[PDB]
Design a binder for these strands. Structure first.
Ligand SMILES: [Mg+2]
Ligand SMILES: [Mg+2]
Ligand SMILES: [Mg+2]
Ligand SMILES: [Mg+2]
Ligand SMILES: [Mg+2]
Ligand SMILES: [Mg+2]
Ligand SMILES: [Mg+2]
Ligand SMILES: [Mg+2]
Ligand SMILES: [Mg+2]
Ligand SMILES: [Mg+2]
Ligand SMILES: [Mg+2]
Ligand SMILES: [Mg+2]
Ligand SMILES: [Mg+2]
Ligand SMILES: [Mg+2]
Ligand SMILES: [Mg+2]
Ligand SMILES: [Mg+2]
Ligand SMILES: [Mg+2]
Ligand SMILES: [Mg+2]
Ligand SMILES: [Mg+2]
Ligand SMILES: [Mg+2]
Ligand SMILES: [Mg+2]
Ligand SMILES: [Mg+2]
Ligand SMILES: [Mg+2]
Ligand SMILES: [Mg+2]
Ligand SMILES: [Mg+2]
Ligand SMILES: [Mg+2]
Ligand SMILES: [Mg+2]
Ligand SMILES: [Mg+2]
Ligand SMILES: [Mg+2]
Ligand SMILES: [Mg+2]
Ligand SMILES: [Mg+2]
Ligand SMILES: [Mg+2]
Ligand SMILES: [Mg+2]
Ligand SMILES: [Mg+2]
Ligand SMILES: [Mg+2]
Ligand SMILES: [Mg+2]
Ligand SMILES: [Mg+2]
Ligand SMILES: [Mg+2]
Ligand SMILES: [Mg+2]
Ligand SMILES: [Mg+2]
Ligand SMILES: [Mg+2]
Ligand SMILES: [Mg+2]
Ligand SMILES: [Mg+2]
Ligand SMILES: [Mg+2]
Ligand SMILES: [Mg+2]
Ligand SMILES: [Mg+2]
Ligand SMILES: [Mg+2]
Ligand SMILES: [Mg+2]
Ligand SMILES: [Mg+2]
Ligand SMILES: [Mg+2]
Ligand SMILES: [Mg+2]
Ligand SMILES: [Mg+2]
Ligand SMILES: [Mg+2]
Ligand SMILES: [Mg+2]
Ligand SMILES: [Mg+2]
Ligand SMILES: [Mg+2]
Ligand SMILES: [Mg+2]
Ligand SMILES: [Mg+2]
Ligand SMILES: [Mg+2]
Ligand SMILES: [Mg+2]
Ligand SMILES: [Mg+2]
Ligand SMILES: [Mg+2]
Ligand SMILES: [Mg+2]
Ligand SMILES: [Mg+2]
Ligand SMILES: [Mg+2]
Ligand SMILES: [Mg+2]
Ligand SMILES: [Mg+2]
Ligand SMILES: [Mg+2]
Ligand SMILES: [Mg+2]
Ligand SMILES: [Mg+2]
Ligand SMILES: [Mg+2]
Ligand SMILES: [Mg+2]
Ligand SMILES: [Mg+2]
Ligand SMILES: [Mg+2]
Ligand SMILES: [Zn+2]
Lengths: 204, 174, 16, 37, 140
RNA sequence: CGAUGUCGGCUCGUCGCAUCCUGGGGCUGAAGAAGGUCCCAAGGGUUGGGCUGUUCGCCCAUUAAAGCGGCACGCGAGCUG
RNA sequence: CGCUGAAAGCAUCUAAGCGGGAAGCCCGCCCCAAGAUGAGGCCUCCCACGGCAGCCGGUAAGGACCCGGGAAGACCA
């Protein structure tokens, strides 16, 4: 159940069989395994992967010890992939071949305090015909005396975005190992520069 | 009028060993375990198994008959064995054996392949006749039913999978 | 379904 | 299947059965098949 | 003369094999033990019952058709959020919950009853980790 | 009655199931295709327009379908009027 | 809808047992989630400091403050 950490670098399109292919380019390799989680020890199976090298001046002592025990130079990010136990001490884009389908997790762009129309695609109010200061307002939020309260979960204004999102079953369009590049067809959560996780897909 | 009290002839040389709540029945064709209520007494006589019931309450009378027959069937199974014949009817309709498996051509856009479960043997003598055979009567009748279900007898035409000795009852169209 | 109105149309509160 | 509060035999070939807490009627004639409900 | 009030006592640990016992008829006894009402110095406003260990909870018994028909219920607060889980399934997934749930309902509501319930220790299967406590086996 | 704002619409739902569609099924005066009738099923879905303040209804053009009810005839300290 | 099968010599999907069977139910997918006070687990780091399950003081690993900012953001985070 292979996976890797990467940064989103940006989109373009490539031409493949006289077709424009929208792509997002991800820098994924190389990911040093820094701890393995096992059933005996940890109760389940996964690999803690590290990514991007860090200035040792910035790595405190409990962190250094962790790296040391793995004989791994310090790294900016540690993230596990579950039910994945690679043979090497290192995971690189090579675990993917063009044509495979992947799921990518990112942290989505953050919209801050969002209105009901941006967040939940609410209709809003009229813009004329008498609408009084309610053009983007939610309307009713309930009934009357029964039940006399608002459902847990009721769609309302509030923060929106900067959340974990996984887009699923994306085509792998190319991989360019000499540059640690994974070209995935479509759109991946988050800004350029943001951290992402690329897993083998759970769709069939 | 009564099944439980009727004794079970046990041919040479099938054996019947009683255990609390089961009877094991071995014969030339294999063995069978008969789960049997703690409440009935299964009794082993010379060349004869009998079952006896603790009282004349409805439940006991009910378990009684069931129990004799259940054992009697086990007995026959390890000696004679059990079988059911299926006839196929209708123009396109055929059966052939693919190794140990049963392949059925019955008008679908594909053929239907049935694997034998352990204890069951499939035989196709002619191509419109199938024979399901085994030592377990329920298992036989079941696998038979399964095969028939792939293409039940039509209501309008002698067409489909039939049990041997199953009457053809059609109804008119127009 | 139209039925009898039971209040007159209200006006905003007169100043207290 | 006919579903109704009054289930009865319709032909002499009709058989009243109790099955899983329910009254059914079975006949070789399919029209006569009934369960109480 | 005022009625006696016990100074703090050392609580006694007890062990109970649930196997084959009738769920409800075991639960009432566990409740008594937890309240501490077998003790002649019973005091209703202090925890002074036994700690109770139960094993083989997965092998509890139930009469009638309850495995199929007894339904446990949970409300999430959300629309449509009433989950119904039947005994069979609860035993097949969190068997210890069955006894736990039955004993819980037989303890007082309030701060003390909640505390009493924490003194119950239920395990599916024959073993438990309270060896250090050397719990006295009870037939009940 | 020292005030429980009252039709319809908009907005936003949520529930029931006597189910409109979709899934499963029995009977059919079920050849097939298409229907009818009953049973199980509430997961999701259930269009846009002309008229009229209308709810309802009729009509146009489509649809798998264009469901019926409850929530103070749901919702005016949310809007309309 | 069955298989096997008594009561009830036959029959019966049922009384013992076994099968098939829905967009529905449970799991599976995606997100939150240990205030899950039942407060889980694993890896790594510090250390057995002074004066008198308590107090007072200096530190350790670390943290905060302050600052330059940020597809994070109302302030906060
Ligand atoms: Mg664990
Ligand atoms: Mg991330
Ligand atoms: Mg933002
Ligand atoms: Mg808005
Ligand atoms: Mg949105
Ligand atoms: Mg929009
Ligand atoms: Mg709008
Ligand atoms: Mg608008
Ligand atoms: Mg308008
Ligand atoms: Mg106005
Ligand atoms: Mg305006
Ligand atoms: Mg109101
Ligand atoms: Mg209320
Ligand atoms: Mg945020
Ligand atoms: Mg290419
Ligand atoms: Mg970007
Ligand atoms: Mg003998
Ligand atoms: Mg005798
Ligand atoms: Mg006023
Ligand atoms: Mg009648
Ligand atoms: Mg008659
Ligand atoms: Mg009959
Ligand atoms: Mg006692
Ligand atoms: Mg008292
Ligand atoms: Mg559990
Ligand atoms: Mg209580
Ligand atoms: Mg009380
Ligand atoms: Mg009044
Ligand atoms: Mg008043
Ligand atoms: Mg007033
Ligand atoms: Mg009021
Ligand atoms: Mg509604
Ligand atoms: Mg219904
Ligand atoms: Mg249908
Ligand atoms: Mg037809
Ligand atoms: Mg016709
Ligand atoms: Mg016709
Ligand atoms: Mg029909
Ligand atoms: Mg019917
Ligand atoms: Mg529904
Ligand atoms: Mg619903
Ligand atoms: Mg609906
Ligand atoms: Mg016009
Ligand atoms: Mg109009
Ligand atoms: Mg109108
Ligand atoms: Mg009208
Ligand atoms: Mg249609
Ligand atoms: Mg319309
Ligand atoms: Mg109203
Ligand atoms: Mg009324
Ligand atoms: Mg309404
Ligand atoms: Mg209103
Ligand atoms: Mg108003
Ligand atoms: Mg209004
Ligand atoms: Mg209001
Ligand atoms: Mg108001
Ligand atoms: Mg209001
Ligand atoms: Mg109000
Ligand atoms: Mg509004
Ligand atoms: Mg006016
Ligand atoms: Mg039959
Ligand atoms: Mg039979
Ligand atoms: Mg008779
Ligand atoms: Mg049964
Ligand atoms: Mg069944
Ligand atoms: Mg079948
Ligand atoms: Mg679907
Ligand atoms: Mg998480
Ligand atoms: Mg915690
Ligand atoms: Mg956590
Ligand atoms: Mg709790
Ligand atoms: Mg913790
Ligand atoms: Mg700052
Ligand atoms: Mg700032
Ligand atoms: Zn009849």
């Amino acid at each position: 159940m292979k996976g890797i950490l990467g940064v989103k670098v940006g989109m373009t399109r490539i031409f493949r069989d006289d077709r424009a292919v929208p792509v997002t380019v991800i820098l994924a390799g190389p990911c040093p395994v820094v701890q393995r989680r096992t059933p005996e020890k940890d109760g389940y199976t996964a690999v803690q992967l590290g990514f991007l090298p860090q200035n040792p001046k910035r790595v405190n002592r409990p962190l250094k010890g962790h790296f040391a025990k793995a004989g791994v130079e310090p790294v900016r990010i540690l993230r596990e992939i579950r039910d994945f136990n690679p043979e090497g001490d290192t995971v690189t884009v090579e675990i993917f071949k063009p044509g495979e389908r992947v799921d990518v997790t990112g942290t989505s762009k953050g919209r801050g305090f969002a209105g009901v129309m941006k967040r939940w695609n609410f209709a809003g109010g009229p813009d004329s015909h008498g609408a009084h200061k309610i053009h983007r307002h939610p309307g009713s939020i309930g009934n009357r005396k029964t039940p006399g309260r608002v459902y847990k979960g009721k769609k309302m204004a509030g923060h929106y975005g900067a959340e974990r999102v996984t887009v699923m079953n994306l085509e792998v369009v190319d991989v360019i190992p000499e540059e640690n590049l994974l070209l995935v067809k479509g759109a991946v959560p988050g800004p350029n520069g943001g951290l992402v996780i690329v897993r083998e897909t759970k769709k069939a | 009028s009564r099944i439980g009290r009727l004794p079970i002839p046990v041919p040479k040389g099938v054996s019947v060993e009683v255990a609390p709540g089961r009877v094991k029945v071995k014969g030339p064709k294999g063995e069978l375990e008969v789960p049997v209520s703690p409440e009935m007494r299964v009794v082993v006589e010379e060349g004869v198994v009998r079952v006896e019931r603790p009282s004349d309450e409805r439940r006991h009378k009910s378990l009684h008959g069931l129990t004799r027959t259940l054992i009697a069937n086990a007995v026959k199974g390890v000696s004679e064995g059990y079988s059911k014949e299926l006839l196929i009817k209708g123009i396109g309709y055929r059966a052939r054996l693919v190794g140990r498996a049963l392949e059925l051509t019955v008008g679908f856009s594909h053929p239907v392949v049935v694997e034998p479960p352990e204890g069951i043997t499939f035989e196709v003598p002619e191509p419109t006749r199938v024979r399901v055979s085994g030592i377990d009567k329920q298992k036989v009748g079941q696998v038979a039913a399964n095969i028939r279900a792939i293409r039940k007898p039509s209501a309008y035409h002698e067409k489909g999978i039939y049990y041997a000795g199953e009457p053809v009852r059609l109804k008119p169209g127009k | 379904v139209d039925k009898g109105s039971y209040l007159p149309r209200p006006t905003p509160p007169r100043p207290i | 299947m006919k579903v109704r509060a009054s289930v009865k035999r319709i032909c002499d070939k009709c058989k009243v059965i109790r099955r899983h807490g329910r009254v059914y009627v079975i006949c070789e004639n399919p029209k006569h098949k009934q369960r109480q409900g | 003369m005022k009625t006696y009030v016990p100074k703090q006592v050392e609580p006694r640990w007890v062990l109970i094999d649930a196997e084959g016992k009738t769920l409800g008829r075991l639960a009432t006894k566990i409740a008594t033990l937890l309240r501490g009402k077998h003790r002649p110095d019973w005091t209703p406003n202090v925890a002074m019952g036994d700690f109770v260990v139960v094993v083989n909870a997965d092998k509890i018994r139930v009469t009638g058709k309850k495995l199929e028909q007894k339904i446990y219920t949970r409300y999430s607060g959300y629309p449509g959020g009433l989950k119904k889980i039947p005994l069979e399934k609860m035993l097949a997934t969190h068997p210890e919950r069955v006894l736990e749930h039955a004993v819980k309902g037989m303890l007082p509501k309030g701060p003390l009853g909640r505390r009493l319930f924490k003194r119950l220790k239920v395990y599916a299967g024959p073993d438990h980790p309270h060896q250090a406590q050397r719990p006295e086996k009870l037939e009940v």
